[PDB]
Amino acid sequence: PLIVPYNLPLPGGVVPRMLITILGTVKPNANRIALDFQRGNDVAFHFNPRFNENNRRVIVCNTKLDNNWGREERQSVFPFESGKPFKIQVLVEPDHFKVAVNDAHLLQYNHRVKKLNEISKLGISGDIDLTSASYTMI
Numbered sequence: 001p002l003i004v005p006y007n008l009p010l011p012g013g014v015v016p017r018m019l020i021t022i023l024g025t026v027k028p029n030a031n032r033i034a035l036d037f038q039r040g041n042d043v044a045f046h047f048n049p050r051f052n053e054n055n056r057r058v059i060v061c062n063t064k065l066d067n068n069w070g071r072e073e074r075q076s077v078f079p080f081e082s083g084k085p086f087k088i089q090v091l092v093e094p095d096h097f098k099v100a101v102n103d104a105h106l107l108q109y110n111h112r113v114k115k116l117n118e119i120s121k122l123g124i125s126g127d128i129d130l131t132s133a134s135y136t137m138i
């Protein structure tokens, strides 16, 4: 098992065709999960499943620039379940991050931070047991 929060360095940043795969299991009674693709202190792409936001499950995506969060992009389709194993795959495409969970497409997030080669770390945190975090080029 890997320790959470986990930092996965992305050498030389990301680039189209790079696929990041995370495998883990949601804790029972989980409250949140977060993936933070970072460019230094900025968060190019924050992916944040929330298990109980005003008694609703929602995935919130955003970007943090100079310590300020921008406009949130929300997705009500919620494929995660407390206590169950999951697979998140994030594929970098030219204009967006494309996310699939358990092999089903979930959402896309348009690139706000354009210096892809400077998004050099991925932080994985939240209420999960982390099994694997890796990348490959497809």
Ligand SMILES: CC(=O)N[C@@H]1[C@@H](O)[C@H](O[C@@H]2O[C@H](CO)[C@H](O)[C@H](O)[C@H]2O)[C@@H](CO)O[C@H]1O
Pocket (backbone or CB within 6 Å): 046, 048, 060, 061, 062, 069, 070, 072
């Ligand atoms: C309904 C609403 O406006 N909610 C927002 C919260 O989402 C927001 O929380 C922060 O959200 C960012 C992502 O945008 C990130 O997940 C932070 O961890 C989280 O604290 C909150 C504070 O910015 O404002 C509320 O208005």
Ligand SMILES: [Br-]
Pocket (backbone or CB within 6 Å): 063, 064, 065, 069, 070, 071, 112
């Ligand atoms: Br922004």
Ligand SMILES: [Br-]
Pocket (backbone or CB within 6 Å): 004, 005, 125, 126, 127
């Ligand atoms: Br954590």
Ligand SMILES: [Cl-]
Pocket (backbone or CB within 6 Å): 112, 113, 114, 115
């Ligand atoms: Cl930029």
